[PDB]
Amino acid sequence: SMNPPPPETSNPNKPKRQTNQLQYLLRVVLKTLWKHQFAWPFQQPVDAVKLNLPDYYKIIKTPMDMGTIKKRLENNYYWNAQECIQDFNTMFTNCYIYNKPGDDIVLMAEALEKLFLQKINELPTEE
Numbered sequence: 001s002m003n004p005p006p007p008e009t010s011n012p013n014k015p016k017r018q019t020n021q022l023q024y025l026l027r028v029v030l031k032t033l034w035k036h037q038f039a040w041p042f043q044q045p046v047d048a049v050k051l052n053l054p055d056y057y058k059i060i061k062t063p064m065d066m067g068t069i070k071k072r073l074e075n076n077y078y079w080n081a082q083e084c085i086q087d088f089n090t091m092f093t094n095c096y097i098y099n100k101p102g103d104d105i106v107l108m109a110e111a112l113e114k115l116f117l118q119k120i121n122e123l124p125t126e127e
């Protein structure tokens with residue numbers, strides 16, 4: 001098996017804007033999750049060669065990871081905070097799709113997802 005190229009993280013032609021939500025998504029949400037004890041499997045694209053997962057990209061057609069999300073936020077790749085929230089949810093659900101209920105890695109994603117939901121609950125929407 002061979003990996004796909006990572007998701008795009010930079011497009012010089014896309015319009016750029018900074019919002020309080022995007023700022024919070026990067027400075028608080030991504031930062032908090034990145035430092036979580038369970039973060040390390042999700043900090044870069046799944047390397048199915050290095051991890052000996054030859055069917056991963058046969059099953060996962062929309063890969064996503066927090067290293068990509070970090071780059072997207074940093075490059076002003078997102079226009080809407082919802083695009084970022086969706087990438088986080090793609091990352092969590094990818095793990096659920098590839099693995100099985102009760103798997104350790106699925107419990108780890110579930111814990112990260114709970115933390116994620118607690119943090120976006122406090123998203124600044126002009127407070």
Ligand SMILES: Nc1cc(O)c(C(=O)O)cc1/N=N/c1ccc(S(=O)(=O)Nc2ccccn2)cc1
Pocket residue numbers: 040041042051104105107108
């Ligand atoms: N499954 C994985 C698949 C992967 O692809 C990668 C990766 O690519 O990096 C890492 C993975 N890691 N898998 C772990 C499984 C258990 C533990 S654990 O020692 O903390 N034990 C428990 C037990 C129950 C609940 C929580 N943790 C740590 C990591």
